[PDB]
């Protein structure tokens, strides 16, 4: 009866495709034909943040848009004050292989993870001095690719074991395990309302999970390679996925289908990191060609190029106030980029 | 104001302490070499980690790291065994390693093609084009014990062994049959044909047949690492 289930799966997939085709009344490029072009946007490196030894794999901005946490492959988590390019804390890490870092929205805890399979949560505002490992979360049978804090107590971590998870820091145990991805879950982003989160995997898919319920609401397909960068629209009703097919794609939750594909013939490298500006008009995508590209989101025009990194730009993040964009590369450098009037 | 001035002075003092610690860490980091152990499950890579963990000290959760001191030169070996069989995404964490020790079973003849395909994949990665591979053809004793005993001729797989002669260079061990040499160097020549028929001038493959003597293996790793360091110094000096 396996053949019967396969036939039923094919029929349901065809039905969903037909529903999507019915819902595709027009193409986003048609509605955004009348938009005045964003113009050539040229932001400069306001501050270069040096001090890391090995490559920088992931960075996260704090809610105050001033402190940023950076993970390096040498085993270092540095909390930089972007305004004065001064390092506040330099946490040594047990396992040097770090691929994710998170700043708690409360600005108290810093998360890290990687090839050690463990999400290490570090308390910064301790009763005493120094920075110590507040908690270590184990239970993921794969490399931790992205970890994000919901509150000061709950953290969602996506791992290479084709699984995302929700952890209670105090309990130290998984509360809800999100399964259904076939490939390794690489990037994970939360909605502005921390109710749903969309996770991109290596199976050329993204999935919209409900945090409390624990079920995969929708699955978005369309990429031809690994979705290795995810980022919610500031509205919360769309997201952007960067893949190794050298394409970014704007998927939409309500229509449950792609809206538009940002790609160019010149670029053949995969996209490393994807971030939406505060207004959602700009998609800053990091590429393997040692530079970032700023696309228009509503149109598909390449608004700008953030050249200035020697190696691939591994991490990219816009601040909550949108005033700056930090791009960290494999050359042990993060650069803050800001636009000049 | 005064309070702001005191806060900025404190921030600069913390930054200075962090910079001192980072300078010390940089000294240690440049004093240690990164070795990534890759190979099949039948290959004895874990045996290698244990062999040099209890020979010069070592650290001792997924990654089985170890750190030792061979003639004052620090080495940081590590094996990633806690992950899944998909490796296109975490292998990228090892682009700056000094070397990749690829341990090959070299005694089963069934997974040898799988080993060659893995070697090709490692050799051709954009993130591993600049990384030299120290190839450790392990299980030489078993290779011999099967080659003399007959039973399963190697010619069944890899048909080119029918039209293969022992390389004129050669280096047979004191007591050894010519057939053992031919099989051994045929496997090594398959690996070197995979290595050389690709990017040159950025990374090299160092072949070594693993023996029961541990000191020879550690010496080969040390010598290969020294060659890699000298070659990367040549490249950074623009004399290559």
């Amino acid at each position, epitope marked *: 009866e396996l053949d019967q289930l396969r036939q039923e799966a094919e029929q349901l*997939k065809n039905q969903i*495709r037909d529903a999507r085709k019915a819902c595709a009344d027009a193409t986003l490029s048609q509605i955004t034909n009348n938009i005045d072009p964003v113009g050539r946007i040229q932001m400069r490196t306001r501050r270069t943040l040096r001090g890391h030894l090995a490559k920088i794999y992931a960075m996260h901005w704090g809610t105050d848009s001033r402190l940023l946490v950076s993970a390096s492959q040498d085993g270092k988590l540095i909390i930089w004050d972007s305004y004065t390019t001064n390092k506040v804390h330099a946490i040594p890490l047990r396992s040097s292989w770090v691929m994710t870092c998170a700043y708690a929205p409360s600005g108290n805890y810093v998360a890290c993870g990687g090839l050690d399979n463990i999400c290490s949560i570090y308390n910064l505002k301790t009763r005493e001095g120094n920075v110590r490992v507040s908690r270590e979360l184990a239970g993921h049978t794969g490399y931790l690719s992205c970890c994000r804090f919901l509150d000061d107590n709950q953290i969602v971590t996506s791992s290479g074991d*084709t699984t995302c998870a929700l952890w209670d820091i105090e309990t130290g145990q998984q509360t809800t395990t999100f399964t259904g991805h*076939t*490939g390794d879950v690489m990037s994970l982003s939360l909605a502005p309302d921390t109710r749903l989160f969309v996770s991109g995997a*290596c*199976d*050329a898919s993204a999935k919209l999970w409900d945090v409390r319920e624990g079920m995969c609401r929708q699955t978005f*397909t*369309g*990429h*031809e*390679s*690994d979705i290795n960068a995810i980022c919610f629209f500031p509205n919360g009703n769309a997201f952007a996925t960067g893949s*190794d*097919d*050298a394409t970014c794609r704007l998927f939409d939750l309500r229509a449950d289908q792609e809206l538009m594909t940002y790609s160019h013939d010149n670029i*053949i490298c*995969g996209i490393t990191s994807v971030s939406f500006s505060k207004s959602g008009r700009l998609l800053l995508a990091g590429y393997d060609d040692f530079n970032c590209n700023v696309w228009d989101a509503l149109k598909a025009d390449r608004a700008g190029v953030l050249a200035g990194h020697d190696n691939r730009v591994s991490c990219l993040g816009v601040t909550d106030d949108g005033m700056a964009v930090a791009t960290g590369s494999w050359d042990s450098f993060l650069k803050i980029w800001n636009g000049s009037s | 104001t005064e309070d702001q001035r005191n806060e900025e002075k404190a921030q600069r003092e913390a930054n200075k302490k962090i910079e001192k610690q980072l300078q010390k860490d940089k000294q240690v980091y440049r004093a240690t070499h990164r070795l990534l152990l890759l190979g099949a499950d039948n290959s004895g890579k874990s045996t290698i980690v244990k062999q040099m963990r209890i020979l010069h000290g070592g650290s001792g959760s997924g990654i089985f790291e170890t750190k030792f001191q061979v003639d004052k030169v620090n080495f940081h070996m590590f094996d990633v065994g806690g992950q899944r*069989d*998909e*490796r*296109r995404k975490w*292998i990228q964490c090892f682009n700056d390693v000094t070397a990749i020790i690829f341990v090959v079973d070299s005694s089963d003849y069934n997974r040898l*093609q*799988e080993a060659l*395909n893995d070697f090709k*994949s490692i050799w*051709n*990665n*954009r993130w*591993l084009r600049t990384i030299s591979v120290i190839l450790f053809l392990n299980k030489q004793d078993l290779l011999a014990e099967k080659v003399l005993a007959g039973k399963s001729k190697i010619e069944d*797989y*890899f*048909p*080119e062994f029918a039209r293969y002669t022992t390389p004129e260079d050669a280096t047979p061990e004191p007591g050894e049959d010519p057939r053992v040499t031919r099989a051994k160097y045929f496997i090594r020549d398959e690996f070197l044909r995979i290595s050389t028929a690709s990017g040159d001038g950025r990374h090299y493959c160092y072949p070594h047949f693993t023996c029961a003597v541990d000191t020879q293996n550690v010496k080969f790793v040390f010598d290969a690492v020294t060659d890699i360091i000298i070659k990367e110094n040549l490249k950074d000096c623009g004399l290559f």
Partner: nanobody
Amino acid sequence: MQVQLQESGGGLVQPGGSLRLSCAASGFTFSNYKMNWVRQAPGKGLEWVSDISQSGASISYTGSVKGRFTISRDNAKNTLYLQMNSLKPEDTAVYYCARCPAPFTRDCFDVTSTTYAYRGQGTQVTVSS
């Protein structure tokens, strides 16, 4: 759309026969993806068999299929072909076509993995007499 690779062909064939396995791929630009053929023998793991590059210039095989089998890559029809000459009982296996991970690359790893996204369901080739 979804990455799909449907394989067709394969069946009971007497030893020494020939058979064409056709993998029709949809959902991606067939042109710029190195493509492999991987089989799985019963009671055994997945073994890479052949690979062909984007333009078709580079074709590589294993020892057991060095001269017997051939690989074709029709870009216009978005199809891959494995021609199977002088079949042997050692070839009784489930055959899959694998679009290896990244475009414009030949350094692709997870083609023989236990779980792999861009791999077809496959066709069962039995060479029972």
